[PDB]
Amino acid sequence: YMSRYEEITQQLIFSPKTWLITGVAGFIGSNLLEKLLKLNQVVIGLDNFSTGHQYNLDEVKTLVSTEQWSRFCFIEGDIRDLTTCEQVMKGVDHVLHQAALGSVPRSIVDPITTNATNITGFLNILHAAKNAQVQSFTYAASSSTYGDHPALPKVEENIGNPLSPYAVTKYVNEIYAQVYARTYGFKTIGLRYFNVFGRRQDPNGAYAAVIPKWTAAMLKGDDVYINGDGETSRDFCYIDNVIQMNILSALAKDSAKDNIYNVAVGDRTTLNELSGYIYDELNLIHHIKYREFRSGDVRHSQADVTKAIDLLKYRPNIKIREGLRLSMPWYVRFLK
């Protein structure tokens, strides 16, 4: 069970609130859209259809009641534009900010647009929220912030130098958030994600995350590439864990705010083991080439998640193996 979460969701259903999800047509955003509409919350959504999709919002329509859906007001717009950020914050209680351009390679290839999206856009949204005097503010940080720090597991206090323009932007999100707490008393929570996966994560496009990437390759019967030696390790975290933690953070005690928390499970899968898992779970649904290391890459990733467990009563319920089983059906229906 996820008791605290269970309690807070109950709390929400009785006294519903108005939420803003930026990046709401994206992977994590539309997943938050699902849960929040299933709790009868009023939700304002903001996306620009950069990496996000209309079909993800169309999917959530089929997944919820028409009554629940009529409380969703979606706005097409850009976080890089301040006035739209201000317009979108009117009467908002809780801010879940997921809008950004991900991908470490994307940021090497084009650090300028990545900067405007992930720094300027984050600040537009943060400032607008402080000005609107929202009840809470939660934003997507990253495990990439750990940079070249060698120790495992990864604790929130200890980071190294950033290895990618992507990492810089996300780290900058944290600095700004902390500084907003210092100067305005606006307390936020930053969630450092550790490779999230699950339903609605884009398998198409040159910048696809590894799990939906390999899944599409394996299904079609194409080559599956391993960047380096495959001993590179990750703490893959199924979406529902991220969903739990965003909501936990939005209704967190005040003393629990102005904090950074790892969002993961505490596990360590190498890229070799992962291929094996994505092979097995696709077999039971009835249907390898090594190259050089990706540049600006983090080597090993494993979260120490006890801070979230401690302060927020986070209870991670879904490990990678169970996560893949729940996700593979969705990907088959998607690429058929």
Next chain:
Amino acid sequence: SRYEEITQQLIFSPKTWLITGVAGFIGSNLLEKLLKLNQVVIGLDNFSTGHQYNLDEVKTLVSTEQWSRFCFIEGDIRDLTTCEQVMKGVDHVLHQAALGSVPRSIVDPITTNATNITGFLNILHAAKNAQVQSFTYAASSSTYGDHPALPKVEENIGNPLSPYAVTKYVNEIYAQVYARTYGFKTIGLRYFNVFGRRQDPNGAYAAVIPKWTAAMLKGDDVYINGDGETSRDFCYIDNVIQMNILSALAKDSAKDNIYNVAVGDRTTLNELSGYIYDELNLIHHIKYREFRSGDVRHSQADVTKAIDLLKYRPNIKIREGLRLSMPWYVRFLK
């Protein structure tokens, strides 16, 4: 001696310099020096906190031939196309364009962010793609933040205390990342409260020295935010010009590095009001309020790094600096 050695070689084989923030306090002082060295100079400013009249002044201090190898473009660092075009044929970049003032950034962090981050990145990236010989940018002693140790060593850094402080720390991190992923080595200069000729005395954001000088001349109130025991390493302008040039022409091993630019002296605000007063009286010529929010408490540089790797010689200290600066202010404000 190394600085004087360098400046001579510059006279003999002049290089092309890009100065961003050329119409501002530090930038215009760099202009005057470079033009006195017969350097080809390209200047970029948007006249935000800068001034056409600062250029006019430099024009009067330098011959008309030296003034003809100055190409000024009015424009904004926030626009990448202008950052790209201004890099044409450039040898050395001195990046000085930014919006200072901690209080400015508390009222309006979005605007401070756009210029100090977006604009900085714009100019970093263009120089990287232009393949210039060097890139040196203005960093800040503010990025020491809440770190209590004295003196201030480049390595030992605390939490930033303001939006302005963030932007200037971000400049360092991006510079580090560009060295990492693109092999483009830069130098960041942590300036420590610079003063001298052309530091704007007007407006709500004026630094202590020009502001206090202005008010003492006008008989207005002189305000000390808090203790008066709040302390700084006031750096005379000619020391900064020296570092900028030493950094522009560093050997490869001295690049991808950060340097404190200061003198190594600690001066309290109480002491400063006395010093400025002393120096104004010699040219034939106080209320306590609350601490300024997001202020750094004590600031004093250890400048041993710059001395070792860049052969820096901190020449002018507070007193001689004020004596050199005071006549400029009287003539200007009159």
